[PDB]
DNA sequence: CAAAGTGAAAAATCTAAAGCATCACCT
DNA sequence: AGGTGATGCTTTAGATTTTTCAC
């Protein structure tokens, strides 16, 4: 059976309010690496991986593999009635429709327990290619929510333009356009703070501002988040989750179709 | 004892009271012996004495002879019912209900007859049942109040030995008229042979045949016109009758007043038609008791036997009658008029015909066009245009000569809308339905419906099926209270929207299987629609080929090319009356509408039974998401506690005396709200799919009563066709002397056949109303669910072909191709057919029909008392084509995924309105701007060679409209301004029983109610007309509704209720403008636009008509996605699939 | 005549803010033994029963017993003017028109006086008993609250269930079934943040989820409250007020139709 | 050629948050002395003042008084991208359709250049003459968020009397008569607790709460409100935004008119 | 006592579920 | 000045009511 035993419950109720928002029907699996999973939207626009590793739980208990389609809009209700510092039993049986949740408290008195139903699901699975990004920024995860929070109330087209001097996050609506600018970090030493980027040729590529919405959720599971695109490969959003793992958001860009050639 | 001798002493009193003014107004009756031929008139209960000094009721028949006398015959017969028992013992309890009733019934004997609902019913059973027979209809109302709790006591008890035994009395609630018409055959507008052979003989009645036409009956249309405090609801309290104007046979009588009307009132002649014609002379008596003494005498000087006015139960007969009980003669002691217990008012000597109870039930008008002035519009053909309604009117009344002009409309109009319309087909009804006419005009459909049913049961020997209650808190399969049982109904589907002219080229997507299955089906569909449609041309065509195959060469020819723009053919495929089509496809009758336990009770029940029609419908139940247990918690709780007495300082009232009205309405109210505080909820709407059999053995009386009604409205319809076809015939030639004979012949005939129509649509609504004899939950829904699944598979083998636009649950309106095959002339040998004119697409659609649709359980009795039940395969349920439209104009809904259903707008070919159905111009008072918008903004939308002309002179008159609703008072005045944005809305109910309610129409009620009196709103019925005010701002429009009745009164009279509801004490301007709610009004406006042209023009992709008005954000949306060059790309797209897996449970 | 005063006067809107939501109507019964409310709500399965003890106010003086015609809903929202901290004096007379309830702000800077209209209606007066009780539980009013909004999510009744080894609040419903078990607390002794019990026979019922979020708005009366249940009693939700006696909400148990009967 | 510097970005995100319920769209004139505004209501019953002069500003320049017709709901939508503390640069050049709103962080990380689109509309101003008002209340902003939109819980036309033990505003509804009272009261003069009430006549004037509720937006932005009423003088509700500025309302005052006149 | 169905627009009000701007302790 | 949970003020999504057309 599959057993999952987590210490900072704060983090997974951060994972699944950032899949709750953006996805309704997803697609989980259980390996001997962890947990992973794999499922896009209902609009085809937006891929999302998330990968828990083995050793970064408390304790796993790993027999076989079971593929899991469990509804994300309602994980996060049964998961909502949860505290951020208790801890966090997942039990999946193998042969059964019901997935068991336990929250223990650190008093180690309020003890939880719940039961969900399962149901078929039928989802693409798509293989993950590797690429040599062009690009590279890894930035704060709160200014990064921030930037995309700032920009959607000016339109849904954004512009993620990196050249020599930074990162563009530009976008335009009716109301006007608004296009920011973020630097190099020179004097800063912590690593939560500071942001860094790496480049092999300026990147200008244009993206679906709600879906940036959407994948920015997961704000205070990490304090940092790395972004990562190249000319016509999808944007990623990594969101590294301690040691635990990491989440990984794929998002299908807008270039210009040259229509007159 | 002595208070029943006196009881019938004053019976008596009022039976020689009657017989006295009978004889005062002719109608003699038949004391000298002989025979004398009458044609029957008027009848109405009155009561009798016999040779055996008996009181007795005896129907009184009227007749009018040739010659114009006419006489009164009262028939003696005993009202009766009949009795249920529960086994063979039926002498002993006849024996025990007449030894305790010696006095009061006068024979029992035991009547067979057949009942639908017994098991094996159809093998030659039958249930005896028992007569009753009394003396008088005061008895039978006695006897059946005596004896009717043991109805309620013996139908509860389920698990003086000659009393309980009685199961349920039947045919109780039948009238004596009624009954009494029913079983002597004796209906109103036939001819007949009366012999009187003395006292001692009955009077006998019997059928004349050979005389056909109609006699020339005494008819009045009286009307009156009263001076009122100003702008007042009518009350008789205050002042007199000015004028009442009555014809007598197409000649017309006026009486005024003199020392109130100014100017000595002359003599003139009304011409509104040719055929309309009142030879008037007026009379100029001094004084009102005078006025009416000269109604009397002339009234009781012409004898009149059909009397008709507007609306004389509610206004005029009620004003007269309070006029003359002030004056001190008697309405009743005078002409037999008094009010009943219904508040109709019915002579024993005369007829009583509101033409407003013809209109409302049988005219099929929109209720905006109700009453008489525009009832003329929709029948006579010819409008009242006489002055302007406010300067004339209200304070120029002293004018007797615009006063008499209104009189004598008020009078013209009745008299030949009853001749016209009201007369021959309120006789035509009369003459099968059982009642007198004011009965027949007063009385609903369904109860018209239930009467004629009545008739053919009486005639078949079958007994009338109780009348059902309805339940209180019906209970679901799991336990839940239905507050609301339903079917589903009609499949209504808007496909497309937007502007389809046949001029304009259209893109179409038919696939080429559609034309290769045609080809082949081709010689079936010609076969058909020359067999099926016309039984003359069934083998007698000569160039049966050399058209057939030219419809072959014209439908593959353009096959090759499917996908083509091309110029469309709108062509609407309607069924005619398929709901009684269908009832008379599958023999559905509500006693046929049988279950599996009731089938297996037969003894018809074989493995190769061809008997049983499965044919399925659409449950559908709102009930309480509270359970049993809560529900049984609740009634308990409810029994527990103590209810406040009904009367003043009476005794407390428990949860065992209250009725079930009283209990269902606590309980109802009690567990909504228990509903919403513990379950977020009060409705679950479920829909679910059930099917039932329908006995095809079964007697075919409502089958036979449907079928005589629909040949009687298929007559008149096929006169409507021969006169149409002889219109189209007249046109396109030189004017001639019998256009305008055509025309209002076909006008007539269409009226007929919509009035006819009303009823045959009845019998389908029949049952499904309360108190019916032939309820059905199951029929009624199996009809619309059959109607349904025809038209969406007519638009499943439309689409294959054009763009079906427009479904109902009548047909369907769609766009096929130009090069499709059309209405085509085929010849024969056959002298009285030797053309015959044939569509294609409804011959393709009615070889769909015979295929799919047809009834092959068709099992009718050949030859009865013989078991002969042959089968045969009758259709009837034919798509008639109408001719092909110019153009259609579809709406659009301002949400995603939602489109405006039953409404649009299709012009015929000529530019002229064919069809404008659904829109807010024929709904009773709406806002007049809408409905101005609405009847002048499809005019431009058959102006332009192409669509974004169309659109662009479509948006120039919405532009001008919203120019004027902007910059309004430009050169605009006043009174147009009040009576442009005017919103008038009508209640059913009173407006105490509006309490706690908040409406726009309810508060403007209450408003006129604290501005003049609450006697405006102690009456139902009350028409408000207003505006939502601003002024209050932040308040909602409930508490901004304001009556228009406070901008003409006087400033010191009207600035106080200027300041009340504004909540603005220190303002001072009296402008409406200042008032008015600018933003309101240009929302509902812009609203209305944008159903109508902007979002179906960016459905047919066009950028904006109206620029002012702007879009939804969806729209807005999809517009700037489709507008710019990036696009969306996918996942699946960028990165390769790895294949698509299944995820199932664990 | 009638005076009343109370330095603590937030405890009167504290209450009134857990009746405005249940009952609409209510009767103020006034005597020397004890100050009595006793209302119904709407959909008369809730009894309410409020009492308010004569010693605990700082001045009282009432001549005889009195009976008063009250909706609570204005009478709360004419309380909810004052704030935490300020005291309230109460005033009538023996027929009056109106409630006269006067705020006074703890430095005299704000006194505030209102005069409401009351409305005369039928006063009914139930005698119910104070039956001895199977089971009680004394246990924070936060984690109660925390209880019914957890259950809320996930289903519309809850079957509370306790014995030896504590108490037990468990639900069912479209997204699964679920349940919350709580100990005996006896490891530790704190002053607020215990959960004691006592029980002769453990004993579950089945009650109305919204009906306990609608009585869970007297959370901040005290941090303290008591849980009174058995066998065909009615629930008593008990909050013990210091020297003000006790507010009591009464729920009926769902007694359903036994199938076996 | 216009440019305008804040370090403070809390005055002008708070300063829209009170202004956008009530005017839709206002034309902003800044001048060479400051940011001056008035501005009409949409329901033409009110006028409100602005007076922000360059004495706080970072750096200022100005070359004429400028009338940008901003939307006020666009323009508050822009000015939450703004942060608490961020600082606020607005530019305006010579031929510049569009209004430059450049945010930079207080860790000069980030510049957050936003267009804001802007159209040009024509108006007519008529000012205000200085008058000698009879009563000046200074009243803490905090408590008249607990004192105006919980006398408006309970009536909407409330008069103002005046005397010298205080100031009276008497609500009356449906509810009842609500009197709220208020002395001077300076036993423990605080510096920001003081009602000081600055009476010359005695005057009695009716208002309406619903209104008095929607200036009330603004008690983040100030410490405390003094509002100035004289003999059928328009009300003036002020605040003291820190020491950059003040924020006036004119509410015309509403007299009940007798029958007899 | 009499009273033909259902579908649907159109608007107006009544509720509750979220979205989002401030408070109950610790360096 | 940063970390958790309530608590109240708008905003929007449906639910419900009532005339009055369609079928
Ligand atoms: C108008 C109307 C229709 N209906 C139902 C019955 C009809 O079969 C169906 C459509 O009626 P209609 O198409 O309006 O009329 P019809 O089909 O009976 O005859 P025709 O088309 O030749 O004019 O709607 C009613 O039940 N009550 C009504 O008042
Ligand atoms: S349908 Fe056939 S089996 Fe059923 S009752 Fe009629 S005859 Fe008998
Ligand atoms: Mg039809």
């Known amino acids: 059976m599959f057993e999952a035993r987590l210490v900072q419950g704060s983090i997974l109720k951060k994972v699944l309010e950032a899949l709750k928002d953006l996805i309704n029907e997803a697609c989980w699996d259980i390996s001997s690496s962890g947990v992973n999973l794999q499922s896009m939207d209902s609009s085809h626009v937006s891929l999302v991986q998330l990968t828990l590793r083995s050793e970064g739980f408390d304790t796993y208990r790993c027999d076989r593999n079971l593929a899991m389609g469990v509804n994300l809009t309602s994980m996060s209700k049964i998961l909502k009635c949860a505290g951020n510092e208790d801890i966090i039993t997942l039990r999946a049986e193998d042969n059964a429709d019901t997935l068991a949740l336990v929250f223990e408290a650190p008093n180690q008195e309020k003890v939880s327990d719940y039961e969900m139903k399962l149901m078929d699901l039928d989802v693409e699975q798509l293989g993950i290619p590797e690429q040599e990004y062009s690009c590279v920024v890894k930035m704060p995860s709160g200014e990064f929510a921030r930037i995309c929070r700032d920009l959607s109330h000016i339109g849904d087209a954004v512009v993620i333009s990196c050249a020599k001097d930074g990162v563009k996050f530009s976008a335009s609506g009716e109301l006007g356009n608004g296009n920011i600018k973020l630097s190099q970090t020179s004097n800063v030493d912590k690593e939560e703070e500071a942001v860094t980027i790496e480049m092999n040729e300026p990147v200008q590529l244009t993206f679906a501002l709600r879906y940036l919405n959407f994948f920015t959720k997961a704000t205070p599971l990490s304090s940092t988040v790395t972004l990562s695109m190249s000319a016509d490969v999808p944007l990623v959003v990594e969101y590294k989750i301690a040691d635990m793992g990491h989440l990984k958001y794929y998002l299908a860009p807008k270039i210009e179709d040259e229509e007159g050639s | 004892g002595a208070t029943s001798s006196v009881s019938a002493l004053k019976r008596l009193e009022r039976s020689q009271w009657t017989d006295k003014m009978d004889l005062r107004f002719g109608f003699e009756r038949l004391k000298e012996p002989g025979e004398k031929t009458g044609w029957l008139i008027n009848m109405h209960p009155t009561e009798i004495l016999d040779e055996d000094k008996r009181l007795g009721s005896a129907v009184d028949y009227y007749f009018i002879q040739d010659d114009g006398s006419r006489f009164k015959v009262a028939l003696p017969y005993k009202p009766y019912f009949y009795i249920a028992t529960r086994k063979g013992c039926e002498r002993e309890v006849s024996s025990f209900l007449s030894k305790k009733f010696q006095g009061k019934i006068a024979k029992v004997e035991t009547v067979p007859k057949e009942d639908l609902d017994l098991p094996n019913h159809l093998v030659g059973l039958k249930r005896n049942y028992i007569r009753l027979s009394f003396h008088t209809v005061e008895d039978l109302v006695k006897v059946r109040k005596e004896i009717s709790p043991a109805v309620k006591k013996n139908r509860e008890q389920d698990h003086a030995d000659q009393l309980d035994n009685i199961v349920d009395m039947r045919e109780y609630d039948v009238p004596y008229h009624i009954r009494l018409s029913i079983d002597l055959k004796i209906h109103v507008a036939h001819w007949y042979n009366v012999r009187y052979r003395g006292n001692a003989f009955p009077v006998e009645i019997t059928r004349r045949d050979d005389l056909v036409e109609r006699p020339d009956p005494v008819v009045l249309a009286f009307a009156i016109a009263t001076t009122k405090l100003p702008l007042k609801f009518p009350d008789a309290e205050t002042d007199q009758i000015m004028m009442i104007s009555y014809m007598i046979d197409g000649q017309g009588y006026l009486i005024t007043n003199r020392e109130i009307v100014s100017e000595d009132i002359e003599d003139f002649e009304f011409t509104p038609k040719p055929e309309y014609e009142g030879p008037f002379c007026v009379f100029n008596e001094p004084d009102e008791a005078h006025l009416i003494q000269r109604w009397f005498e002339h009234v009781q000087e012409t004898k009149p036997t059909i009397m008709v006015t507007y609306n004389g139960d509610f206004f005029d007969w009620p004003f007269v009658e309070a006029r003359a009980a002030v004056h001190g003669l008697s309405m009743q002691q005078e002409i037999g008029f008094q009010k009943d217990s219904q508040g109709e008012y019915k002579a024993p000597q005369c007829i009583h015909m509101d033409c407003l109870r013809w209109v409302k039930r049988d005219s099929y008008l929109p209720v905006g066009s109700h009453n008489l002035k525009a009832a003329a519009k929709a029948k006579l053909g010819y409008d009242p245009v006489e002055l302007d309604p406010e300067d004339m009117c209200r304070m120029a009344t002293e004018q007797p000569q615009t006063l008499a002009t209104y009189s004598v409309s008020d009078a013209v109009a009745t008299y030949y809308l009853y001749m016209k319309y009201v007369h021959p087909f309120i006789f035509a009804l009369c003459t099968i339905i059982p009642m007198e006419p004011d009965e027949v005009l007063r009385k609903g459909s369904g109860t018209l419906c239930e009467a004629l049913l009545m008739v053919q049961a009486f005639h078949a020997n079958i007994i009338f099926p109780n009348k059902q209650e309805q339940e209180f808190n019906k209970l679901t399969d799991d336990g839940h209270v239905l507050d609301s049982e339903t079917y589903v109904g009609g499949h209504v589907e808007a496909l497309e929207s937007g502007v389809f002219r046949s001029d304009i080229p259209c893109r179409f997507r038919m696939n080429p299987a559609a034309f290769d299955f045609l080809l082949q089906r081709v010689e079936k569909t010609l076969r058909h629609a020359l067999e099926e449609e016309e039984k003359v041309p069934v083998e007698q065509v000569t160039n049966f080929e050399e058209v057939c195959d030219e419809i072959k060469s014209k439908l593959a020819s353009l096959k090759d090319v499917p996908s083509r723009i091309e110029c469309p053919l709108i062509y609407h495929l309607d069924v005619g009356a398929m709901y009684p089509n269908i009832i008379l496809t599958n023999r559905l009758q509500p006693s046929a509408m049988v279950d599996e336990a009731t089938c297996a009770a037969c003894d018809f029940n074989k493995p190769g039974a061809n008997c049983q029609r499965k044919m399925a419908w659409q449950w559908r139940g709102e009930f309480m998401p509270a359970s049993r247990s809560e529900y049984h918690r609740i009634q308990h709780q409810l029994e527990s506690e103590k209810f406040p007495p009904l009367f003043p300082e009476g005794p407390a009232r428990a949860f065992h005396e209250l009725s079930r009205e009283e209990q269902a309405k606590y309980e109802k109210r009690r567990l909504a709200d228990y509903c919403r505080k513990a379950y977020k909820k009060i409705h679950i709407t479920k829909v679910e799919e059930r099917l039932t059999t329908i006995c095809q053995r079964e007697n075919s009386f409502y ?444």
Chains 1, 3, 4 share one sequence.
């Not at chain 2, 036979?704 to 008149?716: G, L, N, P, Q, W």
């Open chain 2, 703 to 1146: 089958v036979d009563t449907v079928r005589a009604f629909r040949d009687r409205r298929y007559e008149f319809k096929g006169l409507h066709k021969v006169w149409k076809k002889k219109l189209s015939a007249a046109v396109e030639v030189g004017d001639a002397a019998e256009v305008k004979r055509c025309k209002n012949m076909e006008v007539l005939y269409d009226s007929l056949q919509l009035a006819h129509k009303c009823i045959l649509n009845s019998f389908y609504g029949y049952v499904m109303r309360k108190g019916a004899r032939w309820y059905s939950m199951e029929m009624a829904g199996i009809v619309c669910f059959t109607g349904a699944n025809i038209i969406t598979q007519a638009r499943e083998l439309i689409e294959q072909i054009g763009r079906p636009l427009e479904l109902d649950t009548d047909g369907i309106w769609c766009v096929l191709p130009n090069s499709f095959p059309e209405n085509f002339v085929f010849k024969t040998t056959n002298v009285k057919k030797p053309k015959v004119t044939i569509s294609y697409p409804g011959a393709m659609l009615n070889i769909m029909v015979k295929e799919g649709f047809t009834n092959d359980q068709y099992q009718e009795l050949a030859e009865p008392s013989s078991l002969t039940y042959v089968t045969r395969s009758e259709n009837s349920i034919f798509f008639e084509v109408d001719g092909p439209y110019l153009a259609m104009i579809l709406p659009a809904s301002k949400e995603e995924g939602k489109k405006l259903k039953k409404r649009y707008a299709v012009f015929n070919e000529d530019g002229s309105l064919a069809e404008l159905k659904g829109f807010e111009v024929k709904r009773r008072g709406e806002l007049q701007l809408i409905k101005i918008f609405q009847s002048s903004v499809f005019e431009a939308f058959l102006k332009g060679s192409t669509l974004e002309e169309v659109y662009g002179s479509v948006a120039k008159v919405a532009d001008y409209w919203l120019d004027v609703l902007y910059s309004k008072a430009a050169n605009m005045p006043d009174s147009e301004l009040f009576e442009l944005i005017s919103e008038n809305r009508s209640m059913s109910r009173k407006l105490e029983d509006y309490g706690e309610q908040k409406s726009t129409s309810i508060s403007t009620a209450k408003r006129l109610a604290e501005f003049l009196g609450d006697q405006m709103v102690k009456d139902a019925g009350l028409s408000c007309r207003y505006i939502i005010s601003r002024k209050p701002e932040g308040s909602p429009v409930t508490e901004r509704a304001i009556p228009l009745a406070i901008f003409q009164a006087e400033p010191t009279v009207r600035k106080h209720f200027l300041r009340k509801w504004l909540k603005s004490s220190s303002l001072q301007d009296f402008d409406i403008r200042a008032i008015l709610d600018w933003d309101y009004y240009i929302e509902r406006l812009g609203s209305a636009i944008q159903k109508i042209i902007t979002i179906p023009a960016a459905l047919q992709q066009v950028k904006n008509p109206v620029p002012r008005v702007k879009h939804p954000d969806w729209l807005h949306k999809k517009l700037l996605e489709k507008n710019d060059v990036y696009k969306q790309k996918k996942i699946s797209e960028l990165f390769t699939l790895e294949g698509r897996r299944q995820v199932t449970m664990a």
